[PDB]
Structures are given as C-alpha cells and as structure tokens.
RNA sequence: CCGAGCGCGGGAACAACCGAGACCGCCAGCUAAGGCCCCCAAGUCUGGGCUAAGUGGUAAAGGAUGUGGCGCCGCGAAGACA
RNA sequence: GGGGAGGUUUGGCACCUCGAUGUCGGCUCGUCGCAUCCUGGGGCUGAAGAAGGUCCCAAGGGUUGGGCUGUUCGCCCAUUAA
RNA sequence: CGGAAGGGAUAACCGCUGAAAGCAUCUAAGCGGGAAGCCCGCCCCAAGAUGAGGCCUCCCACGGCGUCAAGCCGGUAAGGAC
C-alpha cells in the first residue's frame, strides 16, 4: 500500500530574475510550487516549496514581446476589454508580468490558488528577510 | 583620424577634443581597436548582419572625431518678402508671415548665428543635433512650391 | 491647493455693477487643523480640518484622544483636503479672494427610488394612442438569443440622489470674513444646512 | 466505420478522423495513435540546417534589393561596378 | 479578361425546432462593426488663394424638424459640421 | 457649471544621423516631430483588493472548568445595539 507523507515543513527558496527568460524561468518556479521534485509527491495536499523572486523588473524575453505581447483584461461592462502591452506592464507594475505567467502555469482548482499564494515576487530585491532563503539557479 | 582622445568601453566609445566630449555608443559585438594615428574597426564575421553594423560604426566614430575636430554647421536661407530673422541673445527668433513671431530655443550644446536676415548658420559639435535642429527650423515654414518663399537649405528651388 | 469645510446656508442674488448675479451663500466657519498626512507617516500629503463646535457630551468617544494630541476644541465633523498643508494653526475664508474659482462638493438631494424617466430622463411611451399601461416604462432592455442577457450597468430605475456630487469652476463672488461667509455662483449640490467642502478649481 | 462500439486512448472539447473490438478482478509489465517546457505522464535529449514573421497559430491571382543555398553566362589588376 | 474578401440582398440545400422558435412597419431602449457622413491627422492633385477631387490614418463623440405613403425604401420642404 | 488644459506613448505621415550596397535610403543600431483616437489628468464607485491595505486615538490580563490541543461558561472595559 503506497506511502503518504505527514505534515511536512515549508522549505523556502530564493530565485534571482535578471537575464532569465520569462517563460523558461516561470516553468521552474511552478514545478517548485507543486512538489514534483520532492519524491513524497502528493497531488492533493500542497507541499511545494515557498518561492521568492527578486529583481523581476529585469526579466529577459525574446522577439519583440515588449511591444508585440499584449495582456487582455475584461471588465463586465460593454467594451470593457483592456489591452495592456508588455512594455507598459514592466513600466508600471512589473512584478505583475511574472505572476501572469506562473499563475497561468499552476493547476486550476482551489489548491492551485493556494499555491499561487506561496509565491512572492518583488522588484528589488530587498524582500522581507524572514528566515530561510536558500538562493538557487 | 587625428585629434583623437578616443577611449574604449564595454560597449560605448568616448571621443574628447578641442570642442568637447561625446560618448558614441556602438555595438558590443564589434572590435574597435586603437592604433595611434587612427582608430580602426573590426567585425567578427562576414555574415549579412555584421556587415551592416561594421560600416555604421565605421562612420559614427569617424564623425565623432571630425566633430570635435572641425565641427559641424548648417546654412539656412530665408526667401520671400517679409520673411527675415535676427538673434535674440542665445535664442533665434524668425518671422515668416505667421501672426506669431517664432521664438526658438537653443538646444543643449548648440549655438546658431544670423550673419544676415537671410543667412542662418547652425553651429555645433554633435552632427546629429545639427542635422535635426537644422531641419526643425526649415519645418517652421517649408518652401512654397508655388513661389520662392520660406526657409531653404542650399538646394534647387521647388519651382 | 486650498480647502475648507462649510454649510450651504442658502442662496439669493446680489448686484455686481449694473447686472444681477445669483449667488449661493456658504458658511465656511473657522476650521481647526487637526492632523497632517505626510509621505513618511501616512504615505501621502493632506490636512484634516475639523469644523463646527461639539458638546463634550457626544464626545464620550475616545475622539478626545485625537483632539488632545492637537489641543483642539472638539468638532462635530472632520475631513481631509488632499495635497494642502497650511501653516500650523487654522484655515478660514481668508484663502478665498473674490474672482477666484472653486470646485464645490456636496451630497445631492435624495430622490429615493426613482423611475427611469426621472432618473435617466428616458422618454417612456405615449400618453395616448393605445398601450395604456406603459406610459412611464423604459420599454425594451435587450435583444434576442444573442447576447441573450442584459448589459452590465444598463440604465434602469432605482435609488437616485443623495450621492457625492462635485460641481466645478464656480466663481467666488464675494467673501465676508466678519461672518466666515462665502458667496458663489449659486448652483451648489445638496440641501441647505448640508455639509459641503470647497476647493481650488482645476481650470488652471 | 457510426448505426448497434455516444464503451476505452489520441484529436482542446466533438457518432462515424487516428489507435483499438470492453467476460470479471489487480496500488504488476510491454506497447498503439499521440506525445515527452508548465497546467499534464514522459527529453528543456543528441547531431546538422533553415526561419525573424508570433511565420508557425490555419487564404488567391499578383507584387518586392527578405534571407540562406546549388547552377550558368559575362565584366576584372592589360585597372572594371559605384 | 483575371483573383479575392464580406455574409447586409435574391437564391440553393432541407440540418435543430410543426405535443408551436408570434410574422412587416412604428415606438421605447440601446449596444457593437468600420468597408468613415461630420469633426481630428495626413499623401497626391491637372493643389495660386478660398474651395474641391482621390487615397491613407482615425470611432472619441455627433449624425435635425416636417410633407406623402402601413410602409422599409424613396421623392419633396427647411435647415445642418454631417 | 462641464466637454478641457496639460503630461506621456503612438497611427498615417514628415524628418536627422546611417550602413548593408565607395553613391543612395526615415532604419537594419540609434533619434526628433505627429491625431477629436491610446495611457494619464477631471468627476463617481471602490480593501469580499479572502492579495480583506494605511494613519490617529481609546480600552486591556482570568473571574470558573479544560493539565497537553484550540476552545468552553458567566461578569465586565473602550464601545455598540435595543
Ligand atoms: Mg503581430
Ligand atoms: Mg474538486
Ligand atoms: Mg470539481
Ligand atoms: Mg410624454
Ligand atoms: Mg389595446
Ligand atoms: Mg393588457
Ligand atoms: Mg450568451
Ligand atoms: Mg446566456
Ligand atoms: Mg432654508
Ligand atoms: Mg436506428
Ligand atoms: Mg461494427
Ligand atoms: Mg456525446
Ligand atoms: Mg473518441
Ligand atoms: Mg486541454
Ligand atoms: Mg469527435
Ligand atoms: Mg468523447
Ligand atoms: Mg467513437
Ligand atoms: Mg497512421
Ligand atoms: Mg503532450
Ligand atoms: Mg495566407
Ligand atoms: Mg489558398
Ligand atoms: Mg499563406
Ligand atoms: Mg503566393
Ligand atoms: Mg510594387
Ligand atoms: Mg562584355
Ligand atoms: Mg597579365
Ligand atoms: Mg548598384
Ligand atoms: Mg473568382
Ligand atoms: Mg447571413
Ligand atoms: Mg441564404
Ligand atoms: Mg429538416
Ligand atoms: Mg437528405
Ligand atoms: Mg416544448
Ligand atoms: Mg412555448
Ligand atoms: Mg412584428
Ligand atoms: Mg419588427
Ligand atoms: Mg480630413
Ligand atoms: Mg487649399
Ligand atoms: Mg486655384
Ligand atoms: Mg490652376
Ligand atoms: Mg483655379
Ligand atoms: Mg477660408
Ligand atoms: Mg502605408
Ligand atoms: Mg480605416
Ligand atoms: Mg428627415
Ligand atoms: Mg433643399
Ligand atoms: Mg453648413
Ligand atoms: Mg453638404
Ligand atoms: Mg492632451
Ligand atoms: Mg500635466
Ligand atoms: Mg504613425
Ligand atoms: Mg540620408
Ligand atoms: Mg532603428
Ligand atoms: Mg527601429
Ligand atoms: Mg510627442
Ligand atoms: Mg491628446
Ligand atoms: Mg476636443
Ligand atoms: Mg502615467
Ligand atoms: Mg498608468
Ligand atoms: Mg458610497
Ligand atoms: Mg471615495
Ligand atoms: Mg477592511
Ligand atoms: Mg474605504
Ligand atoms: Mg481596515
Ligand atoms: Mg495604525
Ligand atoms: Mg491582572
Ligand atoms: Mg490578578
């Protein structure tokens, strides 16, 4: 009868940002939000490490994405469709652009949404130096 | 390429002289090289892309030098009857039919002269600024294609 | 950026030279500055003016603790005027020279549950040729199977009035410091006796 | 082939397209189509090219000094092309 | 002569609805498209100027009141930036 | 009394410098100008922004059972309701 872990313990982690290709990096981050690397993987409990990104205001991206890529956003009202381009995201709220990716790479349910909360993105760094912080790459 | 004071950088190139200093940023994937009497330029490959960048930089830096050397300056004629000009201190002010007399800001590091109501010299070190600002003035009232009025460079009349 | 709280006392008209002018009288009584918003403590800049004398009765609340740290007679009301930091003391009508223009804010009269015709000033049906049970009705509200629903924010009957209404560019017709009075161009939201804040316009 | 296989896998979803004919049980294994960056199992595999349009992510006559590649004719240090 | 786009017209087909999906016009309330009527910005003009012509960019707002007919449509009267 | 002003980025379009391509080119590196449109600015809503924010001020210990777990039962404080 297959193994089932007990109350784990939140391993935290610290990722850079500069020079990282937006999507490429976003993948790794997600796989960390879920277990998938921890061999006691359990798809119904959430125990993926806490992730903390910093200097997100520096993310690389190929092509002409800075002008090409535009983020849509619907409000309930007529014509409520907004078209914000990448250039403007970073120009304004830049931690935002990293979120719109990883979130879009997490599962859909109630647990998936919990996982998003385990992500902390900054443009800095200078993040709140709580405790653990094992920088990675 | 004599008169230099050139200095290399992780991407840009400084060029001092009797006139001033001008940082002339150039492609990073390019070798500048500084002989002693002249500055050379080297491209890493003969690919289609590198060709274009070689010749560009080959000139950017050349003009950076000839800039602090002899310097650049453009001429500007003013045809048409009432059309005339004068120099209000640092700034130029010209009238060309417009009910409003056109005051003109002298940009950072540029100075122009009016050795005559018709003649207008735009003197400056930064070739870019000279070319742009020169046109800016012409734009204030391009030449009529039905007469012989307005600002001109020094080329044939539009007839 | 100026600012000052007052009440709509009422309105009449006075004569400027050989021309009559409708004016609304605003009592912008002396406002004891109470606190200050700063970039360091609050994250923005502003000033919390008090207004109107409170009896220490209703002040049973620890509001006294707020008034103590400023040594101010307890007031009946207090709101901030954004981005306006007067010298430490008290603001008054003195900041309004005649000929200045002001943006006045007030809570409009409350028109209760209002029909579409009064609220949105619709057209409604005919008093006459048939129908006779939709005279004040709004008629159609949609289409058919597509979109097959009604638009967000569709105009429909409902409560309307008694909301934050700001008029703009009203001319300061006069100013009577002997009475903390303030004359304007007449049209100012809210009913008489209603609190109302007066600011500097955004014409220039 | 569906009908009668709207049972299973792939195709985003979808009778008839691709794989394959479900007697029952198994917290065992090899595969098929399709896939192996994240939602989602499995290569951010290896080697050699091409593409800078988000092409790929779904359209024609026709138009253009886009870019890379093979072939042919001609001019050239007896001095050309601009 | 040749190639297309669109899905407002007229058709073709007979796929859901005949144990019911109420058909024109008007009124009311609109919202969306842009292949733009006006206003804003441009290129050319066989553009002197004023005024036009043609193509390009651009929905943000605007886009009148009457006569005739059930009319949609259209004609007409008086205006209009339209 | 309002439509704005103004700031910023752009469309067609107009340019500076400028190779690839000894000239030429607004462009491939790079830059300036340019719309009633875009983003701000104005007015209104708005922390169920479950990502529930911020500031000033006020009241603070258990009074009995639960040893461990968080709670649980009555009397009160600032304060609130009837
Ligand atoms: Mg595109
Ligand atoms: Mg569930
Ligand atoms: Mg479910
Ligand atoms: Mg009526
Ligand atoms: Mg009837
Ligand atoms: Mg009836
Ligand atoms: Mg629907
Ligand atoms: Mg529906
Ligand atoms: Mg009264
Ligand atoms: Mg049958
Ligand atoms: Mg069969
Ligand atoms: Mg089915
Ligand atoms: Mg199937
Ligand atoms: Mg899917
Ligand atoms: Mg199917
Ligand atoms: Mg199926
Ligand atoms: Mg099947
Ligand atoms: Mg096959
Ligand atoms: Mg797959
Ligand atoms: Mg095609
Ligand atoms: Mg085809
Ligand atoms: Mg094609
Ligand atoms: Mg073709
Ligand atoms: Mg052609
Ligand atoms: Mg020959
Ligand atoms: Mg020989
Ligand atoms: Mg040639
Ligand atoms: Mg055809
Ligand atoms: Mg149709
Ligand atoms: Mg048809
Ligand atoms: Mg049928
Ligand atoms: Mg048949
Ligand atoms: Mg039925
Ligand atoms: Mg029915
Ligand atoms: Mg009908
Ligand atoms: Mg009808
Ligand atoms: Mg026009
Ligand atoms: Mg004209
Ligand atoms: Mg003419
Ligand atoms: Mg003529
Ligand atoms: Mg003529
Ligand atoms: Mg005129
Ligand atoms: Mg074009
Ligand atoms: Mg168009
Ligand atoms: Mg009419
Ligand atoms: Mg007429
Ligand atoms: Mg007219
Ligand atoms: Mg006309
Ligand atoms: Mg503006
Ligand atoms: Mg501004
Ligand atoms: Mg443009
Ligand atoms: Mg040129
Ligand atoms: Mg460029
Ligand atoms: Mg460019
Ligand atoms: Mg600009
Ligand atoms: Mg503007
Ligand atoms: Mg306007
Ligand atoms: Mg802004
Ligand atoms: Mg913004
Ligand atoms: Mg409210
Ligand atoms: Mg509010
Ligand atoms: Mg709250
Ligand atoms: Mg609030
Ligand atoms: Mg709160
Ligand atoms: Mg606080
Ligand atoms: Mg105690
Ligand atoms: Mg005690």
Curated annotation (Swiss-Prot), chain A:
Gene Ontology CC terms, in alphabetical order: cytosolic large ribosomal subunit
Q: Tell me the GO BP annotations in alphabetical order.
A: negative regulation of translation; translation
Functional description taken from the UniProt entry: This protein is one of the early assembly proteins of the 50S ribosomal subunit, although it is not seen to bind rRNA by itself. It is important during the early stages of 50S assembly.
Entry keyword annotation includes Ribosomal protein: yes
Question: Which PANTHER family does the record cross-reference, listed alphabetically?
Answer: LARGE RIBOSOMAL SUBUNIT PROTEIN UL13M, RIBOSOMAL PROTEIN L13
Q: Which gene encodes it?
A: rplM
Pfam families this protein is in?
Ribosomal_L13
Q: Which family does it belong to?
A: Belongs to the universal ribosomal protein uL13 family.
MF GO annotations: mRNA binding; structural constituent of ribosome
* Species name: Thermus thermophilus (strain ATCC BAA-163 / DSM 7039 / HB27)
| UniProt key word Ribosomal protein | yes
What subunit structure does UniProt give? Part of the 50S ribosomal subunit.
Give the keywords, sorted. Ribonucleoprotein, Ribosomal protein
Q: What is this protein called?
A: Large ribosomal subunit protein uL13
UniProtKB/Swiss-Prot annotation, chain B:
Please give the superkingdom of this protein's source: Bacteria
Which BP terms from GO are recorded?
A: cytoplasmic translation
Fetch the Gene3D superfamilies from UniProt.
Ribosomal protein L6, alpha-beta domain
Task: Pull one GO CC term from this UniProt entry.
Answer: cytosolic large ribosomal subunit
Listed Pfam families: Ribosomal_L6
What InterPro entries would the database entry show? Ribosomal_uL6-like, Ribosomal_uL6-like_a/b-dom_sf, Ribosomal_uL6_a/b-dom, Ribosomal_uL6_bac-type
Please tell me whether the keyword ATP-binding is annotated for this protein: no
Show the GO MF annotations. rRNA binding; structural constituent of ribosome
Keywords, alphabetical: Ribonucleoprotein, Ribosomal protein, RNA-binding, rRNA-binding
What are the disulphide bonds in this sequence? Answer: none
Is rRNA-binding included in the keywords of this UniProt record? yes
Function field: This protein binds to the 23S rRNA, and is important in its secondary structure. It is located near the subunit interface in the base of the L7/L12 stalk, and near the tRNA binding site of the peptidyltransferase center.
Q: How does it assemble?
A: Part of the 50S ribosomal subunit.
Listed NCBIfam families:
L6_bact
Record's family? Belongs to the universal ribosomal protein uL6 family.
| Name by which UniProt lists this protein | Large ribosomal subunit protein uL6
Q: Which gene holds the coding sequence for this protein?
A: rplF
Curated annotation (Swiss-Prot), chain C:
Q: Which Gene3D superfamilies match?
A: 3.30.160.810, Translation factors (2.40.30.10)
- GO CC annotations, alphabetized: cytosolic large ribosomal subunit
Could you give a GO molecular-function term held by this entry? rRNA binding
Domain of life of the organism encoding this protein: Bacteria
Is Ribosomal protein among the key words of this record? yes
UniProtKB keywords? Ribonucleoprotein, Ribosomal protein, RNA-binding, rRNA-binding
User: A biological process (GO) annotation for this entry?
Assistant: translation
One Pfam family assigned to this protein is Ribosomal_L3
InterPro entries for this protein = Ribosomal_uL3, Ribosomal_uL3_bac/org-type, Ribosomal_uL3_CS, Transl_B-barrel_sf
**Complexes and interactors:** Part of the 50S ribosomal subunit. Forms a cluster with proteins L14 and L19.
Family membership noted in the UniProt record: Belongs to the universal ribosomal protein uL3 family.
Read off the PANTHER family from this record: 50S RIBOSOMAL PROTEIN L3 (PTHR11229), LARGE RIBOSOMAL SUBUNIT PROTEIN UL3C (PTHR11229:SF16)
What's this chain's function?
One of the primary rRNA binding proteins, it binds directly near the 3'-end of the 23S rRNA, where it nucleates assembly of the 50S subunit.
Q: What is this protein called?
A: Large ribosomal subunit protein uL3
Q: Which organism is it from?
A: Thermus thermophilus (strain ATCC BAA-163 / DSM 7039 / HB27)
